[model samples]
Target: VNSFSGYLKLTDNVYIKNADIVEEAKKVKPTVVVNAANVYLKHGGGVAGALNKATNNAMQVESDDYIATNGPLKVGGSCVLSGHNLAKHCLHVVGPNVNKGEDIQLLKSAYENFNQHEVLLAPLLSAGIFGADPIHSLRVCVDTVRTNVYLAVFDKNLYDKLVSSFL
Candidate 1:
């Protein structure tokens, strides 16, 4: 794949090996193809985000890798997992270290407080931050437990693409 000026130029002159992907692309021959990029900051990535993920899985903080421990099902914001539960693994897409070098501590703290039973992480399951101010409430929740916090950065391209594409 060749990417130039934000456009992906596939094949060009190469022999077609994966006709399946090609056929699928033809079917969706979108009038508009959208560019997408998502970045969730690591611990303390945002206004003093935490340095770890949920308790039992907080170890990711050390490697500074952005992997969250997925578990304790039926939890909201875990479609990545729920897709599997529904035998829809094909529909799920997962990412690693796509984590912000900033949101780490927030992730850890959330897990920490929840594990300590100092706070409750309500299932607001929707993939990623849904442009809501939940982080504020979440911060209050953790502080109520003497823990960390979370705040999302302003990502311009995301919503812009959605509008440009669907419009």
Candidate 2:
């Protein structure tokens, strides 16, 4: 039987995303993939696929990489990329939207530095490039991405809602 008990266990097969949530709510099937990425559940884990490698202290996850969903946690051994010194830490934040160009340059810079850490993205930047609305961009940004992050700003306020919707 499928469940949202955070068990990561459905014991069968279920494909989420592109499926209707309203309908899924009514099914007792196996593998119920909730297309919802929002951390609505008060005591929930990070987003569906947010458990990534760290960007600092390659040996362990830097405090900057965590967003307190439960409590101040110490998630250990997240993905860590090496050789990308452009990133002061272990991971690289890439915004494929505005700073995709800059991201590439920095990536090269990191590579040049002999650090090839895997590049990550801010929800805001990823949304912009991947088709997120302005407010949506900020929503993801504020709620998702952690602080003290090394942001790759292609345009300072380009991701802002006011700027995106109007000027």
Candidate 3:
């Protein structure tokens, strides 16, 4: 109940909640956590970087290797790896960079390409290190297909405080 601050009722199954994405990932333990990857799938920046740190870079390393053989990831393409923290699988998607304000379109493509799973965790596309506005990214995240979506934004201090309060 006290998890996220806001919720958008996009559909019966789809939802957008304002909360700490990392925390939610830990709790939800979703089927996949849609990580925003770069062309190389190196996951060295932004949400990708955060996910790498969280999963001990397990996903990042594997994704990088995958790309090495397969080729640089396309804008909407993705790679899946076993879960490490909160998700059962990690879906690495190549999102739009700061110079390319096409996060929504690319993000939608990633979502569409990904096989359906019961639960999915997603970052506010291009909002973090990618330099896109959080508000716009949040809107786009909610607009995705009708399913439960946990949209995480970075709020380490808030998340830490909330966790401590529970204890």
Model 2 RMSD in angstroms: 16.4
Judging by TM-score, tell me the better candidate of 1 and 2: 2
Instruction: TM-score for candidate 3, please give it.
Output: 0.73
Go through the candidates in order and give each one's C-alpha lDDT.
0.23, 0.26, 0.65
Give a tens-digit lDDT track for model 1, residues 47-147. Answer: 11221222222322322332344332221111221111111111111111213333333333333323332211122111134222333333333333331
Q: TM-score per candidate, in order?
A: 0.18, 0.27, 0.73
- lDDT measured at residue 4 in model 3 versus the true structure, 0 to 100: 36
lDDT of 2 by residue, 1-167 (tens): 21322211111221112222222223322211111122121112221122222112332232233333233321111223332212223232332223223332222222121122222222223333333344444333333333221222234465233334421
| Model 3 per-residue lDDT tens digits across residues 65-114 | 78778888787776777778757787776657767666456766665644
Kindly report which residue stretches of model 1 are placed more than 4 angstroms away from their true locations once superposed: 1-72, 76-131, 135-139, 149-167
Candidate 3, residue 91: lDDT: 73
- Model 3: pairs clashing at backbone N, Cα or C within 3 Å: 14-147
**In terms of lDDT, which candidate is stronger, 1 or 2?**
2
Ranking by lDDT: 3, 2, 1
